[PDB]
């Protein structure tokens, strides 16, 4: 008891230093940033706000409990108060509570006590200028609060937090609307909060009506005011719509637009991941391979953690269906390797020309594919395994017997030996000419057209890409 | 020994000579990409210094 008793005092003041001055310098800086400049946006403290939310989300969040700093939840949500010249005295009151916690023990009030607390910005009457500062001061305890996952009686307080946030959203839609600039700082928050909507709804019930609300918001952004918001709303849509049948596939074509400009950076690329799986369901790989590859090269630098690895899990799927696949252990990660071991044996047996080798992996390792929902490829990949085997045997043998080729590929009968080749010629897989008497299959090697057509088609991508590098370099070079 | 170019046949007893001498045009490109390796590698040091 003496040791732990003396180790209790030191921790609480560490946040009570940083977390006290954190949203006071960031929120209080964005307070003057919101009055003017306001160009664009920027509001560079909005990017700093991403960094701060992610800062507490590692350490120390809000609470707990901990029976020490749990009084910060009512502290920052109290005392607007009220107009800016009256806020000086309140900024001093925030510091008076430091001596209160230093003299006597700190008071903890959470859970049922949060109902009047969250209604105290409405009780103060009022902030009254900044809805995003009140949305941030109310959300900042609520957002890491989801990390409790107690699921009993405080989730309906998260529903009350969506209701209080909807009050702040009525105030977001009615107020301003001409050079709003509160919306552009709030669209990051409407993003995060709507993702927390779906997060909380995943633990109870999927949201059918909240998508009616979400689509009201979605379509209502265009054309009046959309900055960075609708790009996130479309990904909210796609996120549970990809998990929930159906039609959502062609839904994107009527939504686009694009929507430009792509934001926020990697946040657009992940959108390309979602639509990459979607466009994979239409079996078009050429459109799917580029959207998959762009997702990985457009996302730096991690950590964290496993979703950047999963996007790569589905990256090489479309390339495996293509028939041309690079060896995937060049992207091998110590945290990723352990996860795709069964999957890695899959691609290992896929690149081979043995059909039985491939059918064994589905039997033993299908249990993992059930969780990923990846069985959509396993039916259509067989076509690619047989096409791979026949490609090998085509280039590697001048003249092959159709009856003797069936034993190696376990084709089992003479009749399908003609069928594979028939569609092989139909798809341009092999140029060989086949004679049916016995029958036999002969093949010929033709070239010299070759470097006429193929390199110029590549050059069309090469040079255009190089001049695009030139344009992107000139753009960032002319700013000084 | 490469001092002589061609191909023989054991069954028909036929030696056939064939030659396509010049290799220069590829040497052009090959010796380029081989050095451009160390080019890009040298760019990673500056790109790493400006960022961190």
């Amino acid at each position: 008891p003496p040791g732990g008793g003396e180790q209790e005092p030191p921790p609480p003041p560490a946040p009570q230093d940083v977390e006290m001055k954190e949203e006071a310098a960031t929120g209080g800086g964005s307070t003057g940033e919101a009055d003017g400049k306001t160009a664009a946006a920027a509001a560079e403290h909005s990017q700093r706000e991403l960094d701060t939310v992610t800062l507490e989300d590692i350490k120390e969040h809000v609470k707990q409990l901990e029976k020490a700093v749990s009084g910060k939840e009512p502290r920052f949500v109290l005392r607007a108060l009220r107009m800016l010249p009256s806020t000086s005295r309140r900024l001093n009151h925030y510091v008076l509570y430091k001596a209160v916690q230093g003299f006597f023990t700190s008071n903890n009030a959470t859970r049922d006590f949060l109902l009047p607390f969250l209604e105290e910005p409405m009780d103060t009457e009022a902030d009254l200028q900044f809805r995003p500062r009140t949305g941030k001061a109310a959300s900042t305890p609520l957002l890491p609060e989801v990390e409790a996952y107690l699921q009993l009686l405080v989730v309906i307080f998260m529903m009350n937090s969506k209701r209080y946030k909807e009050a702040q959203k009525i105030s977001d839609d009615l107020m301003q609307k001409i050079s709003t600039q509160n919306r552009r700082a709030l669209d990051l928050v409407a993003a995060k909060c709507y993702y927390y909507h779906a997060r909380v709804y995943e633990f109870l019930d999927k949201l059918d009506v909240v998508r009616s609300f979400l689509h009201a918001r979605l379509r209502t952004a265009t054309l009046r005011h959309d900055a960075d918001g609708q790009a996130t709303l479309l990904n909210l849509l796609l996120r549970n719509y990809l998990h929930y049948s159906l039609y959502d596939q062609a839904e994107k074509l009527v939504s686009k637009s694009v929507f430009p400009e792509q934001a926020n950076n990697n946040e657009w690329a992940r959108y390309l991941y979602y639509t990459g799986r979607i466009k994979a369901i239409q079996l078009e790989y050429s459109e799917a391979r580029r959207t998959m590859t762009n997702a990985l090269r457009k996302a730096p630098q991690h950590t964290a953690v496993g979703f950047k690895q999963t996007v790569h899990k589905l990256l090489i799927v479309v390339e495996l269906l293509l028939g041309e696949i690079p060896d995937r252990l060049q992207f091998r990660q110590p945290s990723l390797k352990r996860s795709l071991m069964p999957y890695f044996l899959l691609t290992q047996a896929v690149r081979t020309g043995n059909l039985a080798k491939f059918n064994q992996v589905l039997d033993q390792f299908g249990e993992k594919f059930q969780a990923d929902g990846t069985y959509t490829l396993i039916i259509r990949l067989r076509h690619n395994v047989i096409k791979t085997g026949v490609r090998m045997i085509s280039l590697s043998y001048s003249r092959i017997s159709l009856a003797d080729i069936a034993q190696k590929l376990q084709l089992d009968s003479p009749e399908d030996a003609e069928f594979i080749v028939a569609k092989a010629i139909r798809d341009g897989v092999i140029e060989a000419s086949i004679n049916h008497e016995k029958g036999y299959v002969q093949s010929k090697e033709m070239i010299d057209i070759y470097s006429t057509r193929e390199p110029q088609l590549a050059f069309h991508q090469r040079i255009s890409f190089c001049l695009d590098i030139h344009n992107m370099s000139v753009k960032a070079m002319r700013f000084p | 020994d490469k001092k002589f170019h061609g191909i023989l046949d054991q069954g028909e007893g036929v030696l056939i000579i064939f030659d396509e001498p010049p290799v220069d045009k590829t040497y052009e490109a090959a010796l380029e990409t081989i050095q451009n390796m160390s080019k890009v590698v040298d760019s990673l040091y500056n790109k790493a210094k400006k960022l961190t």
Partner: peptide, 30 residues
């Protein structure tokens, strides 16, 4: 190939030297 060879070099010198001369020169002024 030579085209794309020097295209990356132009982007090299330009972007490297300019981004340094942009942020590192502005941070001393303000």
């Amino acid at each position: 190939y030579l085209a794309s060879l020097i295209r990356s070099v132009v982007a090299l010198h330009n972007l490297i030297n300019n981004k340094i001369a942009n942020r590192d020169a502005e941070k001393k002024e303000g």
